[PDB]
Design a binder for these strands. Structure first.
Lengths: 63, 100, 103, 65, 435, 54
RNA sequence: AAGGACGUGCUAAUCUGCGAUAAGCGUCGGUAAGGUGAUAUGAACCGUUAUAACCGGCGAUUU
RNA sequence: AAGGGUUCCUGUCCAACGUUAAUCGGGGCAGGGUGA
RNA sequence: CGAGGCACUACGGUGCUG
RNA sequence: CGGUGCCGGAAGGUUAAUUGAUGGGGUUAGCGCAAGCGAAGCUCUUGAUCGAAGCCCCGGU
RNA sequence: UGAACAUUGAGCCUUGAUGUGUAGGAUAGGUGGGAGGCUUUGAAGUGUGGACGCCAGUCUGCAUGGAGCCGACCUUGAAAUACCACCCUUUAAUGUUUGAUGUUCUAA
């Protein structure tokens, strides 16, 4: 949210998001549609975290 | 690179539901849900690069919804695509190495 | 402003329910609260599955108004506006219902 | 000559018991699974039952003491 | 301890079943402590310490201290367990027996009758076999009278009646509810010696001794094998999917709701107890006739497999896996699910009742028991492995450990479910009214 | 082949686990208490029985 | 641009809001003890006076 | 072909709807299915 | 591919052979 | 071939817009004690004159 | 939206020769001035065209002619003529102005 975004930087957030998008939300969402294990709270994160990183880039080139 | 990370997001869901997708997944071919992408090239490169199976040419057909006769409106569930991705090697059913 | 919270003691201004108090389990946005032992109705609840949904006419908490119940302070059953004039870095309640000023 | 005569009788007790199960299978079947109901009580043949347990506690005092 | 007592006493159906369950376990060791006529406990007691066979010892720990001291229940539950499976194998072999089993309730009742007459035939063979085996060379028996016709005849009559009573007592309590007669008998026998050792150790030492050190090692082992059983027992294979949609609204959407979650994920409760019962059953009797005057070849085969050297481990381990995987295949469930679905007005596609559903249960059943069977063999090697460095403990590890976990975990799986709603109901009652 | 086919579907069905199984192990220990306590009942009531009938 | 088409949530038709960062994302301030818009509030969770949500100014994304 | 757009098939259900009855149907219910 | 035959099967059908 | 329509001819008659000759009228510097006549300039009205196609007329169909 | 050349009405004229009724020798539309021409290539005389041919004749342009003028230095009538103004015409060439057609051109 607040302090989270602010304590990242250009270089840092870039290396963290590759993981977010691919095989921390990717794995989840596939698993989930298949009845294996889906938890609704867990969907609300990861999806809304990789998203947060992309904002900063076009806003101010990192917070 | 050959393609980006956003050209490696094309799978969100498989298709396994009943006949010709459990019968035509065990004995032959394989099937997976392609939401609304409109590409074949990248679905071939997807289960190569990620996962671990190699496939032949991906075969594409649109499915015009799974009808609901009446709902809040009239029902009707929006378009999607079914694709036969078709194995040539690895011969596994995937969901190995933990979820993929 | 507000006299209710989530641990409020009332005395109740609802008839057949006066002289009765409890904590305010939860506040509803319908202008309702849930007070203990009073909002109970006998409710004809289906036992389809028997042991996973209970049979009987089970006594079950409804919701009554917030404007026809009345706070108990700490000595008096008085209700007539509560003060938020005092700040401790955020608004704090006290009684001006009796002017006893116990938070 | 109690242990000799009653011995042949102990075997008799074995008969009435081996049968109580054989016929006592209108709701019992080895590893079957039947949760009883409105039927049951204390058998009619439970007189055999009491005759049995009593029979061996009987061979207790008679055999040693 | 106290709480569980109030709860099961409070619902009156539970009270009077748990009365006979407890008492059964008690009456089991009543008989064992009091000698019977035609055989005396003391001569038997030293004779089984000297052994004629490692085979005999194994047999003695499942069947309990009722074979240790010369007393009724000596043969035990183990010929009924050997009989039931042998009848089920014999059904396929014969054209004739197959038809009796299939035809209605009465036919299935006759099969069940034949098995209990079966059981008693094997008991009279074993009592003849045991009685004459003992005093003719490897030991000597009788202070009631010395050996003779009278001595063996009276000896037979006693144990035969004993086994009749046992089989009728197991059948009785299954019917009434709570506990099986199979789990009751094995459980009474093995665990009787356990609390003195435990009780001793607590008193003596807490930071170590020698005798504490060996028990303490086994205490790590026991917890490991408990972990692994609760590891395999959690999982997800229950498929939930509402049939149709049936418009939207109500809750999140009012569809015909059909939840189908079966299984548990646990196998090798019942099968592992059969697999062990069966292979010692020819073996033990063979041993008795070749220590005594009888067969010397039949015993030799028994030795070739079962424990003596760790080379023989691999021959009991293929047989364990095999007998378990056999027993489950007999037990009807590879397609039970599909027949049920039909009966209920609950239907659905992506799993449409009939043949396709059946094929899925048959897949499920197979991989499940095969993996539960594998765990069983691993569990055995694990004491073997960690003992090949740190001393050689010989408390509960291997065979000893599995029987104890399976019985308490079966019994308080079913019984804690009743118990725990009793507890919940008690706590919520105090809290809502007065308490 | 045939035995590999049993093994290659069983290698993805090997899952079946949880953590918090130390809860269940605390009840295996309470479960152990019940067997220790029932076999200590035997010594107690069957010894009164050893006075009498032994 | 105005206006649409087609999506988008925890899921599911449509409504509401919003655009592949998709019932939201950042930033500064107000506000708050209860909440996660509706039919249908369920499942999951979060806050609790200082760590939910809502409001307003600026920015971002805006197929 | 045009046009229809799932109307095709499957499991199910009969209140209304097929000029009747109606277990049945293209009706009610939702899925499965069109692979260059 | 094949007239037609050999097996089992829930009697829907599948394999075997020519 | 009278009539009517079309085609053709012009000898003559009739004849617009246009050009605006002449006549009549109003005003005033001046002359006139009045009445009246009124230059110049500026204006209103009238139309001589020239006016074609068309018509009239002469044939044919 | 124009130029030359050619014809031909009509508009101002400019410049020459008569303006004949009756009577009057003849050339009087009328009005006014008026005895005037006296020169020596110059009218007249000798001849011509035009004027009248109505009474002898002279007139008026021009060849011969250096021959000193003439309405007859008459006179009739309402007016008298030369000659000069000029009403106006009969009539001709120039300057033209305008409208018609014709002809040729190019540059609109």
């Amino acid at each position: 949210m607040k302090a989270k975004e602010l304590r990242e930087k250009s270089v840092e957030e870039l290396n963290t998001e590759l993981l977010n998008l691919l095989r921390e939300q990717f794995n989840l969402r596939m698993q989930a549609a298949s009845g294996q294990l889906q938890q609704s709270h867990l969907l609300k994160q990861v999806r809304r975290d990789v998203a947060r990183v992309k904002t900063l880039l076009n806003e101010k080139a990192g917070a | 690179m050959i393609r980006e990370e956003r050209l490696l997001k094309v799978l969100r869901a498989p298709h396994v539901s009943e006949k010709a997708s459990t019968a035509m997944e065990k004995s032959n071919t394989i099937v997976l849900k392609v939401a609304k992408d409109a590409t074949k090239a990248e679905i071939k490169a997807a289960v190569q690069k990620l996962f671990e199976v190699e496939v032949e040419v991906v075969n594409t057909l649109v499915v015009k919804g799974k009808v609901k006769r009446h709902g809040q409106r009239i029902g009707r569930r929006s378009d999607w695509k079914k694709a036969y991705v078709t194995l040539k090697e690895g011969q596994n059913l995937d969901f190995v190495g933990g979820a993929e | 402003a507000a006299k209710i919270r989530r641990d409020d003691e009332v005395i109740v201004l609802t008839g057949k329910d006066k002289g009765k108090r409890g904590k305010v389990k939860n506040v509803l946005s319908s202008g309702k609260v849930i007070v203990e032992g009073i909002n109970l109705v006998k409710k004809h609840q289906k036992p389809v599955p028997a042991l996973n949904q209970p049979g009987g006419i089970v006594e079950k908490e409804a919701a009554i108004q917030v404007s026809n119940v009345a706070i108990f302070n700490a000595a008096t059953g008085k209700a007539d506006r509560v003060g938020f004039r005092f700040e401790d870095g955020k608004k704090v309640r006290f009684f001006k219902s009796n002017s006893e000023t116990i938070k | 000559f109690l242990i000799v005569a009653i011995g042949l009788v102990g075997l008799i007790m074995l008969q009435q018991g081996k049968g109580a199960d054989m016929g006592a299978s209108f709701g019992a079947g080895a590893s079957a699974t039947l949760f009883g109901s409105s039927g049951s009580g204390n058998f009619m043949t439970r007189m055999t039952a009491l005759l049995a347990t009593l029979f061996f506690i009987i061979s207790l005092v008679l055999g040693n003491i | 301890g106290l709480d569980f007592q109030s709860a099961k006493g409070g619902l009156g159906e539970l009270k009077r079943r748990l009365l006979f369950v407890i008492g059964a376990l008690i009456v089991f060791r009543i008989g064992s402590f009091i000698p019977i006529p035609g055989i005396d406990a003391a001569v038997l007691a030293k004779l089984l310490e000297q052994q004629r066979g490692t085979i005999i010892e194994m047999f003695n720990m499942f069947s309990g201290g009722a074979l240790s001291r010369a007393s009724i229940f000596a043969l035990g539950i183990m010929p009924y367990i050997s009989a039931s499976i042998i009848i089920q194998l014999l059904t396929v072999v014969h054209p004739t027996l197959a038809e009796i089993k299939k035809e209605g309730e009465s036919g299935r009742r006759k099969i069940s009758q034949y098995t209990r007459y079966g059981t008693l035939v094997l008991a009279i063979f074993q009592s003849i076999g045991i009685a004459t085996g003992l005093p003719n060379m490897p030991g000597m028996q009788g202070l009631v009278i010395n050996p003779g016709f009278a001595f063996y005849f009276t000896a037979v009559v006693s144990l035969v009646t004993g086994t009749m009573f046992l089989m009728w007592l197991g059948e009785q309590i299954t019917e009434r509810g709570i506990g099986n007669g199979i789990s009751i008998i094995i459980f009474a026998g093995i665990v009787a010696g356990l609390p003195p050792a435990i009780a001793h150790t607590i008193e003596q030492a807490r930071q170590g001794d020698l005798h504490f050190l060996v028990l303490l090692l086994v205490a790590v082992l026991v917890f490991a094998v408990t972990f692994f059983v609760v590891f395999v027992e959690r999982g997800q294979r229950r498929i939930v999917v509402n049939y149709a949609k049936r418009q939207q609204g109500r809750r999140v959407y009012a569809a015909q709701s059909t939840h189908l979650p079966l299984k548990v994920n646990m196998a090798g409760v019942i099968p592992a107890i059969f697999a062990s019962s069966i292979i010692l059953f020819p073996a033990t009797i063979a041993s008795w006739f070749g220590g005594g005057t009888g067969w010397n070849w039949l015993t030799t085969i028994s030795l070739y497999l079962q424990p003596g050297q760790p080379l023989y481990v691999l021959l009991y381990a293929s047989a364990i896996i095999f007998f378990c995987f056999f027993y489950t295949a007999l037990v009807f469930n590879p397609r039970e699910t599909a027949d049920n679905l039909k009966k209920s007005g609950a239907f659905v596609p992506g799993i449409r009742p009939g043949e396709q559903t059946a094929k899925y249960i048959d897949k499920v059943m197979t991989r499940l028991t095969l993996v539960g069977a594998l765990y069983i063999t691993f569990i055995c090697l694990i004491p073997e492995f960690m003992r090949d460095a740190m001393k050689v403990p010989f408390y509960f590890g291997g065979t000893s450990l599995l029987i104890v976990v399976v019985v308490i975990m079966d019994f308080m799986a079913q019984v804690q479910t009743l118990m725990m709603s009793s507890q919940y109901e008690s706590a919520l009652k105090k809290a809502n009214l007065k308490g | 082949e045939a035995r590999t086919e049993v093994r290659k579907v069983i290698w993805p069905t090997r899952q079946e686990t949880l953590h918090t199984t130390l809860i269940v192990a605390a009840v295996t220990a309470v479960m152990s208490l019940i067997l220790w306590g029932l076999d200590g009942i035997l010594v107690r009531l069957v010894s009164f029985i050893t006075g009498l009938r032994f």
